[PDB]
Amino acid sequence: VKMSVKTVGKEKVGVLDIPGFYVGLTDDVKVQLQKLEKQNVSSVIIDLRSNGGGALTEAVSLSGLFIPAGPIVQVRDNNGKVREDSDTDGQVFYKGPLVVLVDRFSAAASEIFAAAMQDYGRALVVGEPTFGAGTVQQYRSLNRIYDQMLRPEWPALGSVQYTIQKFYRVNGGSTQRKGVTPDIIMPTGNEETETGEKFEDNALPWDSIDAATYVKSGDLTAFEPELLKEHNARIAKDPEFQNIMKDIARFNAMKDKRNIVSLNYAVREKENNEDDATRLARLNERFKREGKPELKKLDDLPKDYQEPDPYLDETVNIALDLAKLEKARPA
Amino acid sequence: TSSLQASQDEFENLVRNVDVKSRIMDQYADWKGVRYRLGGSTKKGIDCSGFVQRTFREQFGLELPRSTYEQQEMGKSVSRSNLRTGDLVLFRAGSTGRHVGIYIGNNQFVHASTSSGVIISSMNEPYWKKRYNEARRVLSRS
Amino acid sequence: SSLQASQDEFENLVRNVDVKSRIMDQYADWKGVRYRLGGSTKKGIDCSGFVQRTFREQFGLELPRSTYEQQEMGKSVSRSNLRTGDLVLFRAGSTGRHVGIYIGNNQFVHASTSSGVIISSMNEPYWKKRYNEARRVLSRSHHHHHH
Amino acid sequence: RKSEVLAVPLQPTLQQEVILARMEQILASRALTDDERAQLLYERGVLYDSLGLRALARNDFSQALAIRPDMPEVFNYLGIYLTQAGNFDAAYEAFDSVLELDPTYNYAHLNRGIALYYGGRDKLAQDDLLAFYQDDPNDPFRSLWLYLAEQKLDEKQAKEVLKQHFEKSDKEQWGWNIVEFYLGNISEQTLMERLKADATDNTSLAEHLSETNFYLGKYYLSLGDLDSATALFKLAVANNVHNFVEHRYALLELSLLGQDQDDL
Amino acid sequence: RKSEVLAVPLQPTLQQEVILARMEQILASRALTDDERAQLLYERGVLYDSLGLRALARNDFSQALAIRPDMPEVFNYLGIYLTQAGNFDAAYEAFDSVLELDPTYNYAHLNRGIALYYGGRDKLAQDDLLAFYQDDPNDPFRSLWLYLAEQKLDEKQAKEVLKQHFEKSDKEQWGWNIVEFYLGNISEQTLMERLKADATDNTSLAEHLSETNFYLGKYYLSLGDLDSATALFKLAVANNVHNFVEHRYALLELSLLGQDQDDL
């Protein structure tokens, strides 16, 4: 719940780590993203990695901070009535440019959040194409009012969660099958992952209702060449992005014969030593690059935290160049 | 699609809040024309904040603080498009910095102004329309 | 909305107020105020502004500002059947139109250019000569209209 | 013998029921003065009347009178209910009380006129309705009721007076079209088409249909066409606008037709 | 485009109003147990429903439930009101509660079927309405509702099942004449004449006209004649029998037609 909005570094560029769209996530994040409206704003980032969707009203109350009173999500039942949900209480409190970083294992409410910012053009979409959930469920208790009176010996009864509505973006499209294609593609996302909504059983089809009414801030969603080639330079100018591309090439090579694995202890020990030697080589390369002493044996180093995320560093670089543009693009 | 359309909860809410305007108007009828006096809480002379406090305490039982500044942080903020009777309307008067009134519907608010004392005024009046600030809801009961 | 309409109708039904007494309260609070064109304050007031402020602060009817706009409000009424609380329109003044509030017994309170806001008699020669129309805006009770 | 316009019969609005519930709650409580008690009783009686609950309305009115005996509006509603019940002398007395407590309550004149008209005192009814017409001559329904009164005296004279009233009016209010049909100036089809044109929502359509069907029933009854009169009166009362004098007295005319049918 | 029978729209009876007044008086008093209070609340809600005051009826029912939560009849009325309001899922749940507290309340099936019928779950509606038909096959309106359900599945099959039901009945209750018209066996004129014949007083005429006009409106609606359907539904609701399912769902059909007209 830490609120330390200070101008340190080059700009007030921060990363917001969301574990889940909690019912109290707005009530605890309003301490974080509210008090900077009159003062100077900056290019901050919102990270929706490994996110779980909790509530839709909270998703709309949290997404109303960056959009001045606008429809966040459209809902459609089996009959055909469309309703646009937006909390009509509060203007855009955080008037700063924003970058959203999202992974492929993200929540559906996080998809709603990112889709709202992408269709409004106010934020920048960075990361991996999301899971692709487009269904709204209702969570209801199975208790009647007469249960307590005439069945006192019963225990507590279960609950149910059934899809009542289907949600859509204000641009008219949906994320039930196609997901969201971000402006800034990541290397780990370029692989054809065998996970998502398609590989789920009985997944609903895709349908695009007509586009909602919304004010778009510049058509930079389809045209992002400014930062695109800059970050391609940045990923081709560092060996970490290259080693990760080698990892994904190993994935693309192993996935041919992934279903049937062969267990020969000789070749298995061979591949185990190969992986240990490759990890030791990459660790010595990054130590030489960073100036830290090299590791030689696995016993001195205990279990600790490895490198968190270079894609957050690329998002911080993106926010830096976005502040560069905003300094060079008021006209 | 007439009366049954409104749910049972909405029906109870309507029956429970249908007299809010009537209570505020009762307070106005008993209190209209009282002079304006800074830091006054009596019929000899009253200010906007004191009038709001006495009204919300005597008609509803809600004990709001005394200063306009404290009232401005009371309750929950509300937007101009969806404001109901019994909500607090805040203007940027500036004689003390802020001004408080009680919205009664149809761009109207009851308040103790420094010029003509406690009266009804219109939100569309040039002075108040130009000098509008925020709005707060304090009658939490629905 | 719905709550707004219901509360307004409830307030209308519950209030059994006395129009003459309320208008006289406004007069007592406003007697002797000087006349000023385009003035809406106790520093200086005009007939139209006085009528607007009176009908807004004592009842709740948001009438327009100009005498010309006010003259088209409500429904016209004849002199023989004139009730308290109706606005009486004269064809005099700086702009050709003048507004007062009838209070009974051929009397009306108004912001005249002579000695400011005062009560005057409908039977006075000046105003009897300079009468135009009269309209009622304080209605009684109309549910469904005959159309 | 003709196709007719139809509206959705009016249903009680949410406002009416919410207000009636709140009134039940408030009248249930003791903390209210007797003046406020009579005021709320009169308001609830008015609401009952608007909903067609006339016995409950008369009950609330009678209680408000037993609290405050100087309420002319309660006497007015009581006289209207006495007219509907057919006790015309009591209606005369109630309207006399109305004018005694307040002589500017002009609608009392109209109601007493209608009472006398259904009583058989056509001359006094003519007097009262003429006074009401003098109060506002451009209101077409005033001239219509005055004509209904005078028709019991001299038909030709009544039609000529109605034509003069129509000519001297501003002819701005829609009801005059009814008058025009009464004067042989527009076809019934043109009347119904102007009705369809002037109605905006279902409620205004119900109002138009109620009044127009009542006056058309009276017209076809004057010509001796009992069946058309009964059908038009039923179509009028079917609009469920229970506060209109046309609605009440259409029910009354249907009752009189049933009585005439019963007595051989 | 056809001549129609007309009844005097039903007016609240004196008995209803005296009962409602005494109920207000009794509920005003404190000397009442909670069981007796819930009973009186349910009865007063029933009276409000019979008078067309459905919001007040729902209020009294909800209060009686807040007192005693084991009242299946209150759930039945609440589900009916949810159907009328268009909240069909809640209606399903309320009728489920009805059958849970008492599985012998057979009419609940019918109501839930109607709900499902207006919801779009034609098969489940068919199941419920067929169960209700099994409870008493000679009731013509049960077969009528079953046909209304099955028509959304197979028109020919539904009409044949309706003809089979009619043949298998004793054909003693008057309603089968409607069924006969639905089977192309009697002219609409013959239907209306049999209606005139079977009605004794004004109230029976109003009942007949309500039911028949509702089913005829549904018929002309299935054939694509919107105007005739609207007119028949209005003529049904004009009978002021607020307790008939035909009345409620005629209002519902009028609401749905207005909805279809509004959105281009």
Residue numbers in the entry:
A (entry chain D): 345 to 675
B (entry chain I): 21 to 162
C (entry chain J): 22 to 168
D (entry chain A), E (entry chain B): 25 to 288
Q: What does the publication say?
A:
During cell growth, PG endopeptidases cleave the crosslinks of the fully closed sacculi, allowing for the incorporation of new glycan strands and expansion of the peptidoglycan mesh.
We also examined the stoichiometry of the PrcSK-mMepS-NlpI complex through simultaneous SAXS and UV–Vis absorption measurements. The results showed that two monomeric PrcSK molecules bind to heterohexameric NlpI-mMepS, forming a 2:2:4 hetero-octameric complex measured at the eluent peak, with a confidence level exceeding 90%. The NlpI-interaction domain comprising helix h1 (residues 42–56) and helix h14 (residues 488–494) of Prc involved in interacting with NlpI can be well defined and almost identical between the structures of PrcSK-NlpI-MepS and NlpI-Prc-K477A. The helix h9 of Prc can be clearly observed in our PrcSK-NlpI-mMepS and can be well superimposed with that of Prc-K477A in complex with NlpI, confirming that PrcSK adopts the active conformation in the PrcSK-NlpI-MepS complex. Owing to the missing electron density of  the ligand-binding PDZ domain, neither the position of PDZ domain nor the distance between the C-terminus of mMepS and the PDZ domain can be clearly determined. Overall, this study advances our knowledge of how NlpI recruits multiple MepS molecules and reveals the essential structural details required to understand the mechanism of NlpI-enabled MepS colocalization.
